Amino acid sequence: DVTALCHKIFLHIHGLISADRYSLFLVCEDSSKDKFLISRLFDVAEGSTLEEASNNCIRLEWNKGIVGHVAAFGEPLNIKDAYEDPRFNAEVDQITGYKTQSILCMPIKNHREEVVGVAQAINKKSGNGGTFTEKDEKDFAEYLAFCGE
Numbered sequence: 001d002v003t004a005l006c007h008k009i010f011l012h013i014h015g016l017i018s019a020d021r022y023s024l025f026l027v028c029e030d031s032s033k034d035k036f037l038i039s040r041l042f043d044v045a046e047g048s049t050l051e052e053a054s055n056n057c058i059r060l061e062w063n064k065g066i067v068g069h070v071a072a073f074g075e076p077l078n079i080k081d082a083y084e085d086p087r088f089n090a091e092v093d094q095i096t097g098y099k100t101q102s103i104l105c106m107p108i109k110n111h112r113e114e115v116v117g118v119a120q121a122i123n124k125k126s127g128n129g130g131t132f133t134e135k136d137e138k139d140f141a142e143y144l145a146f147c148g149e
């Protein structure tokens with residue numbers, strides 16, 4: 001399998017960097033000059049199957065939300081608060097009814113600098129000072145590099 005095996009790597013990060021939920025959106029564009037984001041797998045937890053992640057998906061605009069900024073350039077960026085930022089999509093908040101305190105923005109690409117999708121993980125954590133460290137950003141892009149293909 002090539003779809004189920006990709007989920008196996010997703011469970012190891014849930015206990016490595018300590019997170020709540022994971023999602024993966026793919027790049028979709030039309031010939032009418034219109035680009036959009038549509039996640040195939042929605043809501044991933046430690047000890048869940050693909051069948052439970054294949055039901056109900058979220059659709060976001062291109063260069064609209066927090067993932068749209070990273071989706072446009074293709075680099076690992078940090079977000080201090082998505083659902084409370086001036087550049088976010090409030091359509092997912094309607095169905096998810098969840099407010100994150102911090103979210104990591106990291107795009108999914110294949111070897112050659114070619115992008116295919118975007119990876120974002122929302123995990124509510126408490127702390128004073130900064131949002132994330134430089135060592136935590138390397139553990140996110142290294143796991144997607146192998147699974148990205």
Ligand SMILES: Nc1nc2c(ncn2[C@@H]2O[C@@H]3COP(=O)(O)O[C@H]3[C@H]2O)c(=O)[nH]1
Nearest residue numbers: 023042043065066067082088089092096
């Ligand atoms: N609760 C929850 N939200 C998600 C998932 N995938 C994407 N999102 C949210 O969809 C949102 C769209 O607006 P955003 O600013 O990109 O912030 C995005 C995320 O917070 C998921 O699997 N679970």
